[PDB]
Amino acid sequence: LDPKDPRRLFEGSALLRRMFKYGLLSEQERKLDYVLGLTIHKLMERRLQTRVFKLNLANS
Amino acid sequence: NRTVIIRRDYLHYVRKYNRYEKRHRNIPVHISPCFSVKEGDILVAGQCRPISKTVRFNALQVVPNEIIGSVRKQFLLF
Amino acid sequence: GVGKPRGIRAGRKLARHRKDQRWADNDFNKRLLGSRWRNPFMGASHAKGLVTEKIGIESKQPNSAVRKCVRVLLRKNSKKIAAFVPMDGCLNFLAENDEVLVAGLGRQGHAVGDIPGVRFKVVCVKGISLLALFKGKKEKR
Amino acid sequence: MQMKGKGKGISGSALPFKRRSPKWLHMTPSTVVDLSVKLAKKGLTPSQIGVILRDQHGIPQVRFLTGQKILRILKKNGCAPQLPEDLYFLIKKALSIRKHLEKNRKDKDSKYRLILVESRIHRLSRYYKLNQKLPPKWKYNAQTASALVQ
Amino acid sequence: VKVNILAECLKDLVNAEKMGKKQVLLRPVSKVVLKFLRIMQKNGYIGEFEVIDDHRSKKVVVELIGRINKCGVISPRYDVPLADFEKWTNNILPSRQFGNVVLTTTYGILTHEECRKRHTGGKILGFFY
Amino acid sequence: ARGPKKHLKRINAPKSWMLNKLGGIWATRPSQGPHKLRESLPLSVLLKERLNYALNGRDVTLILNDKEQNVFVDGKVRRDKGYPTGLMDVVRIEKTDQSFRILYDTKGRFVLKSLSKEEAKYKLLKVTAKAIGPNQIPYIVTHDSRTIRFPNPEIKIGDTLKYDLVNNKIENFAHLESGNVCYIQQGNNIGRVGIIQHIEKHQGSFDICHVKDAKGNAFATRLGNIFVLGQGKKSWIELPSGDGVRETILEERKRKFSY
RNA sequence: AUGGCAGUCACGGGUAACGGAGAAUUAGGGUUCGAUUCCGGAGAAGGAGCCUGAGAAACGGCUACUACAACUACGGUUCGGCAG
RNA sequence: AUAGCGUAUAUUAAAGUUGUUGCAGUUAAAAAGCUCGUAGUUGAACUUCUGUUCAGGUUCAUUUCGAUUCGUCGUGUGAAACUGGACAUACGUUUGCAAACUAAAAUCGGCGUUCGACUUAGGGAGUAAACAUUUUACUGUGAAAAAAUUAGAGUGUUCCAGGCAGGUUUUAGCCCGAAUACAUUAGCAUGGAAUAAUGGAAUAGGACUAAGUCCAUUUUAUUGGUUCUUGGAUUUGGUAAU
RNA sequence: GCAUUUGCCAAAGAUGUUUUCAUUAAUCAAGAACGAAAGUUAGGGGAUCAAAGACGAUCAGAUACCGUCGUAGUCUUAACUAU
RNA sequence: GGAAAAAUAAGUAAACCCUACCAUUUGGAACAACAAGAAGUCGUAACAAGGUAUCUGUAGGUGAACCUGCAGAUGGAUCAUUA
Ligand SMILES: [Mg+2]
Ligand SMILES: [Mg+2]
Ligand SMILES: [Mg+2]
Ligand SMILES: [Mg+2]
Ligand SMILES: [Mg+2]
Ligand SMILES: [Mg+2]
Ligand SMILES: [Mg+2]
Ligand SMILES: [Mg+2]
Ligand SMILES: [Mg+2]
Ligand SMILES: [Mg+2]
Ligand SMILES: [Mg+2]
Ligand SMILES: [Mg+2]
Ligand SMILES: [Mg+2]
Ligand SMILES: [Mg+2]
Ligand SMILES: [Mg+2]
Ligand SMILES: [Mg+2]
Ligand SMILES: [Mg+2]
Ligand SMILES: [Mg+2]
Ligand SMILES: [Mg+2]
Ligand SMILES: [Mg+2]
Ligand SMILES: [Mg+2]
């Protein structure tokens, strides 16, 4: 879409806002183009599993 | 008797090939004596109640026109 | 230009051409000519039948072997069928006149490279999956 | 190059640039219009008349000088050659063929050639009729041709 | 016979840059041929160009820079809603970086891109990159 | 078809009722009344899902059947599970003296506006047809299927009247003409309120209209969908969701979460 | 009175064809399905006829025929039609 | 692969192996032996180009300015093009509105004039209706049911997904929701300058204009008779680079 | 498909054009004109070569490749056949 | 005056029969026929100029492949020889 598309401007932002609530992109990574460079390895790390362990809350 | 057939010429689009083909619908038109007919002229019909099996259109405005021969050959996106 | 015509007004032409030149496809020509309905199963995936007799058939070209086969009579269809009985001892379970469930072998047409005119597989004896009869701990009558 | 999948070239004729009339010549449009219609009266083709005015009386392109195309000049002056050169001639030879064919009812190459020539004539009729430049009921068959012979 | 001289002229030209010709003479020319030309010129593909007055239908001579990679027309000039654009941009153009799909509009003739500005576009004409 | 339909399906019942998709399978089918099927809100919907005074289905059955009379529509008592309360109506909940406007959202959902004993008096009527009937007498008719006897003569067919329910009296009308305020009863643009720009009639069978409003937006709709909410800028009733004006999904965000 | 339709495919035939909303895979374009919750249509064993009513040729109403289902003291009877 | 996994059959993709996009056709399958030819398909080039200036943004550039920060705004130039105006033999005319300024005339004041305020005339601009041959095609909005697809909000224990839910620390009450997009094909409203087709004055006649004459006719209470407005028919004369 | 001379009959390309006409055109289902041989019908004609056939020879076999003869055809008029 | 059975004519028209035709299925045999395979049998066509070449068309003959006449094409065993 055009960079000033009523749609993009709204859905684009909201998609990002969601990448933020789940913390996949850091504050300083707004621009949509970044939505793509997302490792499945990164999205895997934000799981109750990957977290409980990386929170020294488990032995493994 | 005071009834005529008008032929409309339109194009139809073809989703796949992204192009058109020619097509023609024939129409039963009723002609009040008032205007004088002639074959091969453009006519204006209105939507009048069913007058017969086919008829459902009456002539309201007639324009005389010249086509040198075949009315069938004649095909105009009028 | 090439053979095909590139007119914006000539869609019709291209259209009819494709519908026509398309009969040259067997896959098309096949289902289009209700051919599937005329085979022994009448389109069906499987068919029940009665064993008419266990016959054996010889392997082809570089292979030489006695294949196990049962001649079956399909129920509503009522046709003579050539059916290959699978694995090793298999035919030892098929008693003549029992009820059998048959299905095709790799796309209905060419039989396995080895077999001659057989187009079917036998999967059930008296309504008992063969595999089941093939492994002791399963079933037997 | 008309009815010819194989033969084709370039005869000649390229009107010179300068759209005005040649210097050396002096002739009010009218002067020419007389010669033109006079010559025409004698029974000439606008096709042939123009040829004279070029070969004889140094008038390269009557159109450039009058601001009028020959056939037009002629039509304005009643001296209009009824049937156009185009059709006229084609029909002429189209006919000549038929006569020759008769005494040579076996000459096949000529049967063929006529087929092409008669074909053309039907192409002109289609045309000349559509430009309301010839009555719609016009029809070249054998009687249309012999009709002009009388 | 002849048709879409824009195509006649266009390829004659491509054949030029492709052969490495220093300049080209396009024989049958029209307003279209010229507009397209000044659009390529304006975008910087072709160089200076002169129109000779053939008392019949002008002849044009276009100087060849050496940046034209390809410039052709498109068979029947289909109609193209603004919605039909990406289809053609990903289709004709070698990238999302040389956007040059000339179209005809009611708003005249615009670059593949300009048509999005004016917000209309319509029938395809040709392409160059 | 067999005869005349008689039910209604959950799935098929208008999005204006903001209905429960999972709900059941049906939905109270509006009873033939003052307003058309689609343009209406059967009471059961009005109390159960709307007000929420009722709840389960039997809850209604009590309310409208109870010998006390708890529901009033335009100064009258109603006891029909699905009376089609329509646009610009006035509903009173006896036992609490509640007064409501039956008006559409800006997003097209039926909204209940709370009125003061003041507006609860007047109700806005739109003129259906106008012709003279029996023994030389003039009759006017309102969308609300009101039939009027001896009405002021300066009233053209597409008018809008202010009605004093208390006296079943008319007062201050106002036709639709370049320069008025309007509400659109239905369409891809319902719930909007703006200034009429001009009305281009095309007679061929369908006239159109244009409009402006707060943020000066351009609106387009067919006359049949224009309801004159007032004459010359001043609206005549309090509107729901602030002023009758909807926001871009973009304006909603910036107003709420301020993006 | 003699027209009406037709290669811009009439007329006729096939369809394991009730039409849509939609369903499966899809770079784009396509390919194949839609009995089946929404809508519209058709039908209630086949076929025709009708009473009644605001409303159906209804069909969980009636009449006759074709083929059938249930009882019988064989005289006669059935509010006999599960594609709810 | 894993509470799942084989198999049979129809079907999708791989199939640029049915191809409009996007195939092949000397020899691998495939140009007809060859010509004519109505349907069909396809068709050359010309018709305000262009310039000047103003304005609104737009961008981009920046030996640059003011603000903010974790990335934007304002300002200036140049530039392009858009737009929209205007004017230039140059896309319109009437109306009503509004009007913006100017040329005269009036009135009022001071000393016929120096000047000022206030009137008639005047078009832009500013809307709405009537016109620019007729369509194609494109813009845009009206219409395109719901459910489904996309999709916003929303921790149903995640999730399928439902459309709910959020805060009792204002709790006989509070806050917030049920949004949005796509919908091609045919119809409607509408903006339009390109391509494309179609059309206007050539037998002549057309165009604009004045008068004359004849036919037809609305309002004049109505009927006549005149006249007259309004349409149409001609004849003539004038105008126009016919 | 067309090569002896000469004479008629209608035709054709290309070139040459400061001649007219001014889109008249490209290709084409239908639908037609042609299309060596061989072959067919009814007449001509019949020199040479020659399918079938009759013979010699060659071969294990030869009604085949060589040799001696020979009918249809090959030539023609008028029909038909289309590869 | 209303009104049951009965009877009546024109009508809608069930079923049934006859006369034609369509669609969809399904059926049939000895001998025959077709399909596929081979170090069956007889010979050798074709490739090699495969006994001095294949091949196309048409015609005629023959255990068989095929031979033969007339006309072609090289995909040939030639891209070539007036002095
Ligand atoms: Mg055409
Ligand atoms: Mg093998
Ligand atoms: Mg040439
Ligand atoms: Mg009810
Ligand atoms: Mg109406
Ligand atoms: Mg049918
Ligand atoms: Mg279907
Ligand atoms: Mg249903
Ligand atoms: Mg309906
Ligand atoms: Mg059941
Ligand atoms: Mg697998
Ligand atoms: Mg295949
Ligand atoms: Mg002007
Ligand atoms: Mg010689
Ligand atoms: Mg012949
Ligand atoms: Mg003979
Ligand atoms: Mg010997
Ligand atoms: Mg001899
Ligand atoms: Mg063998
Ligand atoms: Mg041979
Ligand atoms: Mg033979």
DSSP, res F17:
G
Closest CA to F28 of F54, F1, F2, F46: F46
DSSP, res C79:
-
Q: Which of E:3-62 have CB within 8 Å of D? A: 55
Q: Alpha-carbon distance F109 to F241, whole Å?
A: 11
Q: Alpha-carbon distance E3 to D31, whole Å?
A: 43
Lookup result for tokens 């069928």: C81
DSSP, res F9:
B
Q: Is the CB of D99 under 7 A from strand I?
A: yes
Residue of B nearest to C15 (CA): B17
Locate F22 and state its tokens: 């999972």
Residue F245 (CA) to nucleotide H127 (C1'), in angstroms, measures 25
Residues in Cβ contact with B51 at an 8 Å cutoff, skipping those fewer than 6 apart: B30, B58
Locate D70 and state its tokens: 């020959």
Locate D51 and state its tokens: 């040829």
Locate F123 and state its tokens: 């109700």
To the nearest 10 degrees (0 to 180), the angle between helices D85-103 and D108-130 is 160
Closest CA to F57 of F90, F92, F30, F82: F82
Q: Radius of gyration (Cα) for chain D, nearest Å?
A: 19
Technique used:
X-ray
Neighbours of chain A (3+ CB pairs under 8 A): F
Q: Which of C14, C16, C17 to mutate to test the interface with B (most CBs of B within 10 A)?
A: C14
Letter string b/e over residues B9-43, b meaning 16 or more CB atoms within 10 A of that residue's CB: eeeeeeeebebbbeeeeebbbbbeeeeeeeeeeeb
**Cβ contact F85:F40 at 8 Å:** yes
Helix, strand, or coil (residue A15):
helix
Q: Alpha-carbon distance F196 to F210, whole Å?
A: 6
Cα F1 to averaged position of ligand 9 atoms, centre (Å): 9
Put simply, the answer to whether A6 touches F253 (Cβ < 8 Å) is no
**Helix %, strand %, coil % of chain F (to 5):** 15, 30, 55
Locate C111 and state its tokens: 């039989």
DSSP, res F104:
E
Cα of E9 to nearest chain B Cα, Å: 26
Locate D141 and state its tokens: 């068959």
Which string of DSSP letters, residue by residue, matches F154-215?
A: S--TTEEEEEETTTTEEEEEEE--SS-EEEESSSTTTT-EEEE-------SS--EEEEE-TT
Rounded to the nearest 10°, the torsion over CA F160, F165, F171, F173 is 0
Letter string b/e over residues C68-104, b meaning 16 or more CB atoms within 10 A of that residue's CB: bbbbbbbeeeeeebbbbbeeeebbebbeeebebbbbb
What sections of chain E are H helices per DSSP? Answer: 5-19, 31-42, 85-92, 114-118
**Cβ contact C91:C54 at 8 Å:** yes
Q: Alpha-carbon distance F31 to A49, whole Å?
A: 57
Letter string b/e over residues C3-20, b meaning 16 or more CB atoms within 10 A of that residue's CB: eeeeebebbbebbeeeee
Q: Alpha-carbon distance D126 to D87, whole Å?
A: 11
Helix, strand, or coil (residue E38):
helix
**Cβ contact B64:B49 at 8 Å:** no
Measured between alpha carbons, how far is residue B56 from residues B2, B33, B60 in Å? 13, 17, 13
Q: Alpha-carbon distance E16 to E65, whole Å?
A: 11
DSSP-assigned beta bridge partners for residue C55: C69
Dihedrals phi, psi of D37, to nearest 5 degrees: -70, -35
Closest CA to F236 of F138, F121, F110: F121
Q: Which of E1, E55, E57 to mutate to test the interface with D (most CBs of D within 10 A)?
A: E55
Resolution in A: 3.9
Starting at the edge strand that comes first in sequence, how are the strands of the sheet with B57-62 ordered?
B3-14, B19-30, B57-62, B43-47
Letter string b/e over residues C41-67, b meaning 16 or more CB atoms within 10 A of that residue's CB: beeeeebbbebeebeebeeeeeeeeeb
**Cβ contact C98:C135 at 8 Å:** no
Give the distance from CA C69 to its chain's centroid: 14
CA torsion sign, C67 to C70 to C71 to C72?
negative
CB atoms within 10 A of CB E121: 26
Helix, strand, or coil (residue C71):
strand
CA torsion sign, C27 to C30 to C31 to C32?
positive
DSSP, res F29:
P
Q: Alpha-carbon distance B54 to F67, whole Å?
A: 62
Q: Alpha-carbon distance C105 to C90, whole Å?
A: 17
Locate C104 and state its tokens: 């095709």
Where do the DSSP E strands lie in E54-122?
59-63, 71-73, 101-104, 109-110
Q: Which nucleotides of J are covered by protein (CB under 7 A)?
A: 25-27
Q: Classify strands F90-93 and F71-73 as parallel, antiparallel or unpaired.
A: antiparallel
**Cβ contact F160:F176 at 8 Å:** yes
Dihedrals phi, psi of A40, to nearest 5 degrees: -65, -25
Q: Which residues of E touch C (CB under 8 A)?
A: 75-78
Q: Alpha-carbon distance F35 to F46, whole Å?
A: 15
Locate F76 and state its tokens: 């009258």
Q: Alpha-carbon distance C66 to C72, whole Å?
A: 18
Within 8 A of B68 by CB-CB distance, chain D residues are: 129-130, 132, 136
**Cβ contact B33:B61 at 8 Å:** no
Neighbours of chain C (3+ CB pairs under 8 A): B, E
Residues in Cβ contact with E56 at an 8 Å cutoff, skipping those fewer than 6 apart: none
Own/partner contacts of B62-71, CB < 8 Å, gap of 24 or more, are B62/B35, B62/B36, B62/B37, B64/B38, B65/B40, B65/B41, B66/B40, B66/D132, B67/B40, B68/D129, B68/D130, B68/D132, B68/D136, B69/D129, B69/D136, B71/B7, B71/B39, B71/B40
